[PDB]
Amino acid sequence: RSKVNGQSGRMEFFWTILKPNDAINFESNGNFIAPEYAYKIVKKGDSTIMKSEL
Amino acid sequence: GLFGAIAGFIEGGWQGMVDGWYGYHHSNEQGSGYAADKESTQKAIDGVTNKVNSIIDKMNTQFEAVGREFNNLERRIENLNKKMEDGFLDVWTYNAELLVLMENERTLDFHDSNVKNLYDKVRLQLRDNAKELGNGCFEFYHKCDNECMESVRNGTYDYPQYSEEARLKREEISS
Numbered sequence: 694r695s696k697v698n699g700q701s702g703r704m705e706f707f708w709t710i711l712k713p714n715d716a717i718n719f720e721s722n723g724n725f726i727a728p729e730y731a732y733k734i735v736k737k738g739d740s741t742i743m744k745s746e747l
Numbered sequence: 748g749l750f751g752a753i754a755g756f757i758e759g760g761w762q763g764m765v766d767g768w769y770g771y772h773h774s775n776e777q778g779s780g781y782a783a784d785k786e787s788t789q790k791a792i793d794g795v796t797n798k799v800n801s802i803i804d805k806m807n808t809q810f811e812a813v814g815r816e817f818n819n820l821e822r823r824i825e826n827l828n829k830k831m832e833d834g835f836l837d838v839w840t841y842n843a844e845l846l847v848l849m850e851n852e853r854t855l856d857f858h859d860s861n862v863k864n865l866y867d868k869v870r871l872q873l874r875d876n877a878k879e880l881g882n883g884c885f886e887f888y889h890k891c892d893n894e895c896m897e898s899v900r901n902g903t904y905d906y907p908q909y910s911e912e913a914r915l916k917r918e919e920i921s922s
């Protein structure tokens with residue numbers, strides 16, 4: 694692959710919502726970019742992303 | 748206009764009548780002067796207020812978040828959104844524009860009617876106690892002091908009182 698910021702390797706990221714009292718089980722023998730931090734969320738509604746230079 | 752009064756058989760309005768939309772101008776021995784008719788001005792200001800408030804009130808306003816959330820391989824949905832977005836703007840732009848054009852005609856005809864109705868109100872009070880000059884004025888066949896003019900302006904003109912004095916002046920004009 695073409696170099697982007699010096700790198701020809703790529704990093705592909707994935708996400709999920711982990712319900713209260715569920716568990717997430719990772720198994721990897723290589724190439725794993727593991728979590729250290731995660732984020733607590735409660736969502737009571739929606740909007741969108743605005744594009745603005747202000 | 749539709750009702751023939753404003754910019755019709757009454758040519759031009761009155762800079763000198765500052766205190767209302769429609770009213771009177773009297774002229775007698777004591778002096779001349781302007782007076783706003785408050786009943787018909789207040790009615791009209793009630794109607795036009797109500798008109799304006801409804802055009803604004805009746806609009807239903809919901810929360811909407813509108814952005815560009817589709818990527819470079821979702822151009823077909825992005826175009827569905829554009830057709831939708833653009834479509835509603837065409838609708839609202841046409842309705843707003845015509846709504847304003849159409850209610851602007853009705854508001855001016857309303858005023859025309861209001862003025863014609865006031866003229867007819869004085870007409871019906873005075874009957875033959877006054878000549879009808881046809882430019883919106885009445886020439887009285889009797890002497891009409893300030894308290895008489897007030898009686899015309901507040902809808903309590905006493906035709907009987909002046910009726911005799913008037914017909915003697917009409918009989919007299921037949922010479």
Ligand SMILES: *[C@@H]1O[C@H](CO[C@@H]2O[C@@H](C)[C@@H](O)[C@@H](O)[C@@H]2O)[C@@H](O[C@@H]2O[C@H](CO)[C@@H](O[C@@H]3O[C@H](CO)[C@@H](O)[C@H](O)[C@@H]3O)[C@H](O)[C@H]2NC(C)=O)[C@H](O)[C@H]1NC(C)=O
Pocket residue numbers: 714715716
């Ligand atoms: C995620 O973890 C929760 C809570 O786990 C509990 O606390 C942790 C700090 C550890 O000490 C765990 O070992 C401990 O279980 C799990 O939910 C819990 O499951 C256990 C059984 O695995 C429930 O215990 C039961 O209790 C009832 C009576 O209350 C008995 O009848 C059963 O025999 C059994 O002992 C426990 O109540 C429950 N707790 C809550 C608050 O839900 C959860 O299962 C786990 N994730 C997954 C994927 O299972």
Ligand SMILES: *[C@@H]1O[C@H](CO)[C@@H](O[C@@H]2O[C@H](CO)[C@@H](O)[C@H](O)[C@H]2NC(C)=O)[C@H](O)[C@H]1NC(C)=O
Pocket residue numbers: 894895897898901903
């Ligand atoms: C309408 O105007 C007339 C004329 O002024 C009022 O009647 C007179 O009121 C004055 C008080 O300024 C009295 O001095 C007279 O005695 C009244 N004259 C007559 C013939 O009644 C009258 O009050 C007004 N009416 C309304 C409903 O506005």
